[PDB]
Amino acid sequence: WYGGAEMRTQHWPIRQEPQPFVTSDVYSSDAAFGGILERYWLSSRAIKVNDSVPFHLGWNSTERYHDTPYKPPDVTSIHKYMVRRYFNKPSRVPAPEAFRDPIWSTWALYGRAVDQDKVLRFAQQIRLHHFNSSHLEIDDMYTPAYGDFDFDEVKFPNASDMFRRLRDAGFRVTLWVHPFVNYNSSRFGEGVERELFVREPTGRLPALVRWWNGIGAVLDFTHPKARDWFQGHLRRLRSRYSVASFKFDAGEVSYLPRDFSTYRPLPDPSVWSRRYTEMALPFFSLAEVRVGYQSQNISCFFRLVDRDSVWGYDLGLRSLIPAVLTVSMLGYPFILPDMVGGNAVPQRTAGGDVPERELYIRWLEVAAFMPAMQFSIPPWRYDAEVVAIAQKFAALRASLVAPLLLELAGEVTDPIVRPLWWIAPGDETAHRIDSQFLIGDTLLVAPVLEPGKQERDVYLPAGKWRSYKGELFDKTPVLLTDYPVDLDEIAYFTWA
Amino acid sequence: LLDLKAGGFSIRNQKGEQVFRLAFRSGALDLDSCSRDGALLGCSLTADGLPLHFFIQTVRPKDTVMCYRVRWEEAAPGRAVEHAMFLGDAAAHWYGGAEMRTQHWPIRLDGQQEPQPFVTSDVYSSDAAFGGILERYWLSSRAAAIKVNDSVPFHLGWNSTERSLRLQARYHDTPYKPPAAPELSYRVCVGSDVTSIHKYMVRRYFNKPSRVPAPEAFRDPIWSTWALYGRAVDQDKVLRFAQQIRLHHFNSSHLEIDDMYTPAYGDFDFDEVKFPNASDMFRRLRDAGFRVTLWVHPFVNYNSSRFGEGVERELFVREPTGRLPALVRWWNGIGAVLDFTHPKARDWFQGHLRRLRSRYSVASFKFDAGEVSYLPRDFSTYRPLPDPSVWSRRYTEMALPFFSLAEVRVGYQSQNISCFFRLVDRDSVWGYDLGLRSLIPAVLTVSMLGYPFILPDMVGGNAVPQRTAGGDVPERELYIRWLEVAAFMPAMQFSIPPWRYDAEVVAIAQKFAALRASLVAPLLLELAGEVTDTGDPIVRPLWWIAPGDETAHRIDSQFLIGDTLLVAPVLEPGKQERDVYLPAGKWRSYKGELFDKTPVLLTDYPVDLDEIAYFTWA
């Protein structure tokens, strides 16, 4: 079975007392449901839970309105029927360069301590190592307090000159934003007085929340005034600095209080997540969100919740294909699998400071074949061979992958990243495979996802496949055993 | 002496009068389930066949007092318990309960009220809610009294058609949490006379203050900036006020600087714009012989420099999950409220009070708010409060280190806190709706509940627009008549001063200050010292010395100071006389007239604008 929710430990196929099926931050929890989910499950043997339901999901591996935020008021053919019936499609395609050039993020590289000096040094190193850039994403924290939209003049003494130097060096820029106003923000009082925040149950006062950056209120995206207000500050940041778009962080209702009031009543709390994702709409072309609750027709990128610099299915390298396939199934084609190499969080890093070298390389390779590719910890943090491998995969993405992604993106208005069973719906091996995927119907990808491996088994389904080296495999289906894939290579095959 | 039927019970006294009558209103007993073992009558199910823990236990604590312990405890959640207590015929008068907005003596409750939580509320704007000072205690002129048990999730309503109080236990739609199944339980006691049974009940249930406030608080006028200047108080205005107090030759217990002297609500430091040299102001006030108290409150607004400090040190009342501060609205805006159950929040509050005394030799503090009507519906505290109003108690405890010149405006078992208790803001009107005619009822009500050191708010009221007979300030006759009755109360507080009017008003105030100093103050100090022993109030109703006298039971325009000084102020406009009731015994007027043909109603007894009628026991 396939579908349901993005999870912390993501298996494909899918593989707990029923808890609310609501948008949560699953970074620290293997119980909760991730920021992107639909009440939709698909079987390899060829269900849509009704939107009305105060829906709670549990599970029992042995056989395979109270205490809740809910208030009362062949396999390919059937999947395509269900997708067409229930999921709206994006009507627009993001910027073409987002499907070709690497995105560069300050977050994993610098953390909160990002600076004017560090942004410009990052951009210079991107140019010196001869990489294109879709855009540069300035993350947490570039403001004096969480809720202020203006740049902190201590860390950014001449924002204008930074943006001018970045523009002159051919860099598009996106800015990190979020739905919170902390109590020590210069905008908190403004928000209390204009009644822009999510309220306690009686609906008279703001309700305080805790998120990873502290304590404040959360904007009510059901309130026209709160939306106009949020949008106004985004438009001011574009006007002042020619910023292209925004990374929309949080959006999960796990950051809203248990019981809460909104301008419009939300019998389904997760519709708050939807209303937040709608803030991406005016800047969709280079926007990203990390939640999706009927957010499919928002034509921006959808980011997997923070990946850890580990190998395993627990937000690591082996989670990428399951997570991307899961999200693709739910009608979100424009997927960004977070950061190449992961976020390098201490105690959650195979390595110490940064991901071990082999992990960075293997990740880079699989990320080069995904709809959008984002570096933070850059190739030149390692050595010249890693830079060269990244240059090779940038070139290969530009010439082979990007043109195919752009065609499939235009077509969507089906997913872009497809499971093997998409073209082989009757094939039980294709049903189980988690280490391979398709881009459209014609490009099959088999990355190495383990350390100390210069080969792997590659399953080819029925029909004819041409390897990158030009080998024609037409005695299919077949398992190619110990197929050579050196550290600096990926196995891919084209339809023929 | 108790008749138990399926639908309620009645109690008689030894003379065979019905002194208590109560209807069961959430069910009936199945009497066949009842049995008597000696003094205990227990019943095990209702007339619908639902299981019940019901008993009446008779207790004879003294030769002259019969009590009845009553429990009605339902089997499970879902089932609110209601008993309707009938007040009875027109000869039965009742006293106690709560300070209310419209305060009558004896108790009169108009219209219909579904039982609402018996919790400390701000009744300035509401004739429904229960005021800042209340006890679950009602007293009858027929010498019966009821104390509702402290355990009860107690809700009080009333029904004027049958003249009943609606006593209710419930756990749905209420700030009451069960201690970590509804139960209505109470004791009814019967005595020989209303004074005897009241003194039995007071001695059993109410703690006494162990200390007396500063002697001068019982003699000299208190001067408040609030009604005179409002929020816009400043350094110039405080010193000008103090100079005028001295020039018009008035003593001062202390000067009370009210709202607002800080840059934000939650900051303890003085605002340097309005008070450019606080130190020099306090030095000039000290040199001119002025003790000073400062207005404080339990709130920290979101734009206070101390708000972040309070979030981080977790000093505030939390939302139900107990993780984050809960925001509240009060009349000065939006912030958090300090958790006075938290040792750290108390140390913190106290620290800032001690710093204000150390820095400025401030004497004490006026502790504003304290009502749980300013706490959120559902809320968490460091120690759990199954009874939310215990928060009010915990707040009043902040007065303890500075009791001598402290005032609070709430009391929830706060009796043994030996500070003054202020009536909630009086309006500059004549009527029972927080006006002149409310003073005697409100003071008598609070005195009955074990709070002897009463401050009846501000002479002339607070002069709020839309709520002032006069316009800008109270009409002249109202100010004078109020001044006169306030001169006979345990503490007297001016804000709008006599010289706002004319020289005749100043002279009247000087006369009443002199009369308070020489006649009233010496008697107040003796009775205040006596409370600590007797538990008896300072301001007493006429029936205190005349418990069998039905006229004394009904009088709301007269009161006693102790047993020996009877006071009859004029409480109406255009009157230079009033009827004065003297109970049995001998009474000597201020002019020396001996009345010994008593009881008597003295009709059209002369009391000019600048006079009060008083009589001494002879």
Ligand SMILES: *[C@@H]1O[C@H](CO[C@@H]2O[C@@H](C)[C@@H](O)[C@@H](O)[C@@H]2O)[C@@H](O[C@@H]2O[C@H](CO)[C@@H](O)[C@H](O)[C@H]2NC(C)=O)[C@H](O)[C@H]1NC(C)=O
């Ligand atoms: C006005 O106050 C004076 C002075 O009060 C005395 O000193 C104060 C600092 C304080 O400690 C008071 O408690 C003192 O009594 C009053 O004059 C005194 O009156 C009392 C009795 O009330 C008498 O025993 C004292 O001997 C007097 N002391 C002096 C210095 O004269 C005066 O009574 C007050 N006037 C009014 C109208 O209250």
Ligand SMILES: *[C@@H]1O[C@H](CO)[C@@H](O[C@@H]2O[C@H](CO)[C@@H](O)[C@H](O)[C@H]2NC(C)=O)[C@H](O)[C@H]1NC(C)=O
């Ligand atoms: C207030 O008390 C009155 C008097 O007991 C109630 O009115 C009576 O209600 C009963 C209900 O069964 C009627 O059968 C009586 O005949 C009524 N008599 C009169 C004169 O009204 C009234 O219901 C109570 N009000 C509330 C709000 O509970």
Ligand SMILES: *[C@@H]1O[C@H](CO)[C@@H](O[C@@H]2O[C@H](CO)[C@@H](O)[C@H](O)[C@H]2NC(C)=O)[C@H](O)[C@H]1NC(C)=O
């Ligand atoms: C002052 O009055 C308070 C309020 O009644 C007393 O507090 C109670 O004391 C008992 C026994 O110490 C405790 O078990 C209760 O929990 C207290 N109640 C509350 C609400 O705090 C206090 O004991 C009195 N102190 C003195 C010295 O009389």
Ligand SMILES: *[C@@H]1O[C@H](CO)[C@@H](O)[C@H](O)[C@H]1NC(C)=O
């Ligand atoms: C701002 O608020 C956060 C919590 O919301 C707190 O940790 C931090 O100390 C505050 N910063 C300042 C400048 O006060």
Ligand SMILES: *[C@@H]1O[C@H](CO)[C@@H](O)[C@H](O)[C@H]1NC(C)=O
């Ligand atoms: C960089 O961008 C240019 C301009 O659009 C494009 O022709 C080229 O393919 C890109 N370079 C790489 C390495 O993909």
Ligand SMILES: *[C@@H]1O[C@H](CO)[C@@H](O)[C@H](O)[C@H]1NC(C)=O
């Ligand atoms: C009153 O409450 C006490 C203490 O909770 C309880 O034990 C007692 O028995 C109650 N009295 C009645 C008459 O129910």
Ligand SMILES: *[C@@H]1O[C@H](CO)[C@@H](O)[C@H](O)[C@H]1NC(C)=O
């Ligand atoms: C706090 O908010 C109130 C209400 O708007 C405002 O009048 C006051 O000046 C504010 N105080 C500070 C110091 O921010």
Ligand SMILES: *[C@@H]1O[C@H](CO)[C@@H](O)[C@H](O)[C@H]1NC(C)=O
């Ligand atoms: C207040 O007055 C005294 C005496 O004039 C002076 O020495 C002190 O520094 C002044 N302080 C301020 C706050 O102006």
Ligand SMILES: OC[C@H]1NC[C@H](O)[C@@H](O)[C@H]1O
């Ligand atoms: O605090 C920054 C951090 N927050 C969580 C996001 O998922 C990350 O990409 C990054 O924006």
Ligand SMILES: OC[C@H]1NC[C@H](O)[C@@H](O)[C@H]1O
């Ligand atoms: O804001 C101050 C105001 N608040 C309510 C009090 O009861 C008044 O005396 C006065 O202190």
